Amino acid sequence: TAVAPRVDGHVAPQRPEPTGHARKGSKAWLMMTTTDHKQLGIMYIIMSFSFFFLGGLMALLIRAELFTPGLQFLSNEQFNQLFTMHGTVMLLLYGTPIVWGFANYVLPLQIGAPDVAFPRLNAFGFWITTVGGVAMLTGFLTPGGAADFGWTMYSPLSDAIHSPGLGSDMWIVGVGATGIGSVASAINMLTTILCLRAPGMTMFRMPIFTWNIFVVSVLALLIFPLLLAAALGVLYDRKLGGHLYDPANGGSLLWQHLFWFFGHPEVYVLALPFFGIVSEIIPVFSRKPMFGYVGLIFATLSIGALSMAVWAHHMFVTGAVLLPFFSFMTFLISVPTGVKFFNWVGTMWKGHITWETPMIWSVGFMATFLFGGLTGIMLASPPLDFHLADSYFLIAHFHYTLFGTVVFASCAGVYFWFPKMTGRMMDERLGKIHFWLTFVGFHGTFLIQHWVGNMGMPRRYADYLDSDGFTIYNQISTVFSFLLGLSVIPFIWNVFKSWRYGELVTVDDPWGYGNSLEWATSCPPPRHNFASLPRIRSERPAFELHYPHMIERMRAEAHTGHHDDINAPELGTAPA
Template identity: 55%
Template sequence: MTAVDPTVDPDREAMGGADPDRLVEIDDFLGDPDAHGPRGLPRTIIGWLTTTDHKALGIAYIVTSMVFLGIGGALAGVIRAELAEPGLQLVSVETYNSVFTIHGSVMVYLFAVPFGFGMANYLLPLQIGAPDLAFPRLNAFSYWLYLIGGAVMLLGFVADGGAASFGWFAYPPLSGAAGTPGIGADMWIVSIILTGTSGTLTAVNVIATVTMMRTPGMTLFRMPILTWNMFITSFMVLVAFPVLSGALLMLLADRQFGTHFFDPVDGGSPILWQHLFWFFGHPEVYIVALPFFGVVTEIFPVFSRRPVFGYKGLVLATLAIGALSTSVWAHHMFATGDLVLPFFAATSLLIGVPTGVKIFNWIGTMWDGSLSFEAPMKFAIGFLVTFVAGGVTGIMLASPTLDFHLTDSYFVVAHFHYVMGGTVIFAMFAAIYFWWPKVTGRLLSEKLGTWHFWLLMAGFNVTFFVQHLLGRAGMPRRVPDYRPIENFELWNKISSFGFLILVASMVPFLINVVRSLRSPATVGADPWHANSLEWATFSPPADHNFTWLPPIRSERPVFDLRWINFEGVGAPTSADAWEARHDHDEQWLPLHQWSDEEEQKRTTGPRPIERTSEGQSSDEDRADGDRGDDGEEIT
């Protein structure tokens, strides 16, 4: 024990100084990482094409979505280059219109949502102690649907007449056959039906997994917040995505089969499309955001050495967001005037409350903590600040009084790039730096991570902050050209310059990734001293994830185990659970007929914990009394 430091809160001291000799390391329980068959990702093309492993598919989702991020970013580069000066310099108007349409569509449909699904794939079974998602082959099917859907959208660029050019929300009549002729528009519709179906199937899979495949002891209120958020997000997907797919089929029928759902000339209603689209579109915003809220809720506790502050409040806030998000859609339509404005103003303002609660939960988690600032924590704090900046403009836009002026201007562009762009990208990099050791068995360089973070922070804010001013001053969105007024020019130049910094920020990241992948995979199971179950298995995890699980008596099973030698630190019942498991093993394991090989494995492993009163360390602790086998048993 370290000596009492008078500057330290006595409450803290009561927890005991951290004496590394008495802390339990997960690695000591796991033994030889390669004793349980192959680990890591498929190594052959056939392996990738046929895999149903949630980890391989998760990585496939994440890598694919980051490729789409690169493509969407390149399209953004075209937009910022064109807008650096008034007038047309770089591309034709037709091309520009396709570019911003596909930029938005790629970022929303092919990057942000699928990245979240990728995390759900990789992490969710690990976090609840399951060997895979409930329907592994359905999961593979979802991935391939997504990839094909994405390819169909991009192939629009080589189609006759170019890619779709009606904006990512495709308002008819402009998106009808007369407004936008050409097969590229139909390809866009089909693409989103495919990716939407992929998302719906993944949501079914996630709900089934969380409902049916939690390991014993993993009650709902012991699930990590990331898993909670994926779970709630999946319900929102089930509400929202089928509506979009249905509306898109109607639009396709209008274009191809002569129906008139949205065609005013023949009695259809363009407003109907807007209702259907935004009934998808606003839950969609939270479908994008909630998984990333989950990411930072995993990261703040680890680097603050504190539990999540207000866990249940946080879950309730997420549920409130999920519920309210289905009743705010028409705030995208205030300017139509064809609404009960106060109702949608009320729900839209109200959804700010649970969102604000989350911010204070995160700050409360850090409060009184012991904060260290490794790359994941830097990005998580960057997320927090960016998200608040985007949130307060959201409150402004929720008021129709102000929205009448601001909607469809660059103010809205700035707002949703803060909430959907900034928060997603900061939290995404937080996730990448945080789980990189788990996925690859390697660490990323902190020095390059620091460069990456500060360049991204600078680039992001320089690019998007001035867009608030542009929009308020009257620059509409979706224009390749603007009036050559002094400040318009200056602000657009600043914004385009900021984009260059954003691009530069990707350089240290890519160097970091390449360097790390070339280094040997030597990281242990739990390099960050984290909390949730994915850190209780090898890095990368073994096939079917777990060879061993700690008892689960709180939302931090790995933390409870690490501190099990200290009174009153972990969950109160976790020590009892450990004893019970030990007693069970002593009583029952001798009855088991072990083969020589099994006996060998059982008796040669390490024995790190000295809890038994007899002081005799026996290897039985390693066997899992709570469930008898690894996760495969409950499938």
């Protein structure tokens, strides 16, 4: 290992300015024209949280109308439009774009690149996703309204003969545009990992967030073409008079098979990157390495393989899929998804945990998501899914699970990387208020729905009778739903206030124990990320950079076995 000369006249490079000091006109034309991956990432994240507010407003209208038996202000049609568009907005305009926004921001900082591979394709992905959102929501401006066939768009209910409004077309092209955005983003991230890593940043030294973005890019590239093909087939059918999805052509189950071959990998595409964010956060605040790193990589790639073979557990009650095959496959993919929890407990096992906001959000994620997945294996068993399919039990399952990942771990990522993004910290107290409001409201909303679903309530029911016995459960659930809706008020205030008046960051790593490479650079990074690079040797280079006296210790304690090769002889001779 070489050593440089103590060069004369050396002073550290200049720190970039934090947010809130901007002059007018500084971002308008830049936003419109930038190809900076990290401004594009900030734009992605702001956009996706705005859509989160839209979709959640739709959800709270749904919860208001389910508060008591009769139809108090909504119609059946409007309730159907509401749940359809709540589902579509939250999955395709919040979830996938926030995945690609976090990827865009932090990934080149993690692998040590200045840019992404294809900057203008990155810009294109952002703008086409925004246009997809605008198109999808434009259906509400019609007199008939938005699409109202559920976010799955089952056939023949989606045929023109059975859903003739223009919103039903708008929905299709909306999801199509969002998929186009996703494939652009996927191409970018994959090439950027293959072609722009730093010296010594071998594949098995990347952080785990990078590995997850790798495999979900592969999955997205598999699946989003297929959704565009199937939905342009539907639009072909509707506009030209085709008959591919005719019921006498087996078209109903053609659609269901195609849709779920796209759609279950999409929920894994949403889950894995946020597991990766949590695997970044948990070791930083435990002051301990990420336990079982290579095993985590194998588990991630195992999910990537299995996700394409588990698809038809969304079709058990159709009486038209081979039950044991998909049941066993789902039971298998439960295994690597669950190994992640063992790894996070190993990362916390006898650590020195400090409870800043991102650690609180991450442990809340773990607690929330465990119950959702335990609920999931019940649905993996067809004997139970015969009763549980399309019940409110299913609503409770996937809300526990999609909040666990895409909401809890998304806020964990926001709190964790806000200093790096902006050069400013957020208010820890307001963050804890946000967390406790979200936690209490969420469990109060969706825990009691397991019971009302088991008791016999189906999903997508605008109205019910007071003889069903559903009323009291719906009332409790809606009260806590409005609480959960209030939870975003401290979050918006915290972001806004801290963006322009937040505590200034004076250190490269304000949490102290940053593992990944993004904490080896300033807050915020310069335009091309790095003013200088460290030696990459571990998978946590920044930790080795800031605490060299530990580099002897960790190498001794890394393994449980009694490895003695610190007394091994010299190897090689000289050149490097």
